[PDB]
Amino acid sequence: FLGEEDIPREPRRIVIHRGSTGLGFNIIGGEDGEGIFISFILAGGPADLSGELRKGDQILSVNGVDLRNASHEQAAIALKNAGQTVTIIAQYKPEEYSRFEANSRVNSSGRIVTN
């Protein structure tokens, strides 16, 4: 059903209330421009419970701080020290993301498929 509908590609604002716990996701990128992408969403974590983030999403900013051209560690530092309420502006970029994970590609609906 849903899985055949196109994944929205416009930027989205996601407000996560995580208090003093991890956001519950992994980031890759931050080397030479690339950008910061979500590579994994932890089951049960705040990011998962938000139901608004997914692997392949690029983190454009955290609490107003532009992360488009952030380095890996600084981006991590920004997220970890973002505070209890984290406002992320994210944008689905599967083609860009697919470059990181082995044997991964994008299907007609924009879904990241790994072979």
Binding site: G22, L23, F25, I27, I28, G30, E31, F40, E73
Partner: peptide, 5 residues
């Protein structure tokens, strides 16, 4: 690099 946050 990959970091869990």
């Amino acid at each position: 690099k990959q970091t869990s946050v």
